[PDB]
Structures are given as structure tokens and as C-alpha cells.
Amino acid sequence: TVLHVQEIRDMTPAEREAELDDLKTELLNARAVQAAGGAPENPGRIKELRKAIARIKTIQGEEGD
């Protein structure tokens, strides 16, 4: 959602990796908040974070990095 395919392709191989490690971190922190029974959740995102990560990895493959 907040991150579309065009925008991912408009990134440089280095921006995808930077964007990748960024999403992974948001995710890890979402899971930490979740692990702590934290309610300030928004389920639609922890799910989107996974998909966003998949898209970036998909593109990195298509582009050759």
C-alpha cells in the first residue's frame, strides 16, 4: 500500500537494500511490541510490512539487484 511497485523500481539497487533493512526493522519492532502484549498495534501494517519486504526482494531479483 503505502509503498507501491513503481516506487520500488524507481529506487536504486542501494535504495532498495536501505529500504529493505528499514522495513525489517519496523517489523522487528512491531513484533517486539506484540511480544510485549502491546496493544498500540495496527494489524494491517505488520502484514503490509511482510508484503512490502516481499515486493522489494522480488524486484531486486528482477532487476539483478
Binding site: 525489517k24 522487528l28 513484533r31 517486539a32 511480544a35 510485549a36
Partner: peptide, 10 residues
């Protein structure tokens, strides 16, 4: 696979 999964908070 990643090493860390999440904080074990108990």
C-alpha cells in the same frame, strides 16, 4: 533466515 525473532518479554 534472520537470527533474532523478537524479545522474550516475561
Amino acid at each position: 533466515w534472520d537470527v533474532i525473532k523478537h524479545p522474550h518479554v516475561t
